Amino acid sequence: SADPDKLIVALIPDENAATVIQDNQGLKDYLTEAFDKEIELVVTTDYSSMIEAARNDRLDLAYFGPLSYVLAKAVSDIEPFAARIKGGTKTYNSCIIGNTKKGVTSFDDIKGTTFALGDPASTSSRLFPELTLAENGLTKGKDFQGVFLGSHDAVALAVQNGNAQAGGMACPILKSLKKKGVIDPSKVTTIAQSSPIPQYPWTMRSTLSPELKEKIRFTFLDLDSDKVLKPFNADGFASITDSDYDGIRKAGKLLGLDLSKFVK
């Protein structure tokens, strides 16, 4: 297990498993030839199942969300090493959205609604949107009710068809879904965009040999292929460290997030 013939490679389920698996097929191939190893992709049922797999050393690489990374890191020996970069920027934003037809175009209009959230351990579809609503005088459980719909796709669709009159999701996923014709820009209004969040970290199991780790780090950081990178809307991968995610630790402490809800 310090240098196995097969690498288990886990991907956070931020969208439908089918989409996540298809988008990563280019990378799967590249890594297979770069390493001379069998590559198995895993897409779990939710973010917490992925944290528990990290915890029991079942993963070798793991593409986490920022909050899910901070959670897994506390109970696992994984370590960060790369993140997507695009026109010099290594960050993304959370979007607050509203149902256009019902006139939900401002924070005041969220009062008395169902507000759509993603997975409970999501950075841009749970943590950041709840903080943002609170900073505009709306407290969950008294001014509105949240509902956990599991993924960012599901949040976007719920707001568009009015099952929820507002919600919170990652801005790159919203942009992607409009490009594909899934989300109609006339039906969903962007009410706000948060400050920058650090990108999703690629991580690796810590008990892998020094030589393999450097090879993994190099391969990602040196990567330049359009087959691999085009489904990601990225120019490459840039280096990152654990302290890039202290902002996220601060935000989670402030909201009152509970590691025991997500692990054990």
Residue numbers in the entry: 9 to 272
How did the manuscript describe this experimental structure?
Here we elucidate the molecular basis of high-affinity phosphite and hypophosphite acquisition by determining the ligand-binding affinity and structure of the PBPs of phosphite and hypophosphite ABC transporters from environmental microorganisms. We over-produced and purified PBPs of three putative phosphite transporters; PtxB from the globally important marine diazotroph Trichodesmium erythraeum IMS101 (Te_PtxB), PhnD from the oceanic picocyanobacteria Prochlorococcus marinus MIT9301 (Pm_PhnD)35 and PtxB from the soil bacterium Pseudomonas stutzeri WM88 (Ps_PtxB), as well as a PBP from a putative hypophosphite transporter, HtxB, also from P. stutzeri WM88 (HtxB)18. The structures reveal that ligand specificity, measured here by thermophoresis, arises from a combination of steric considerations and the interaction between a ligand P-H hydrogen atom and an aromatic π system in the binding pocket. The structures of two distinct types of phosphite-binding protein and a hypophosphite-binding protein reveal that a P-H…π interaction ensures high-affinity binding of specific ligands, representing a universal mechanism in these PBPs for recognising ligands with a P-H bond.
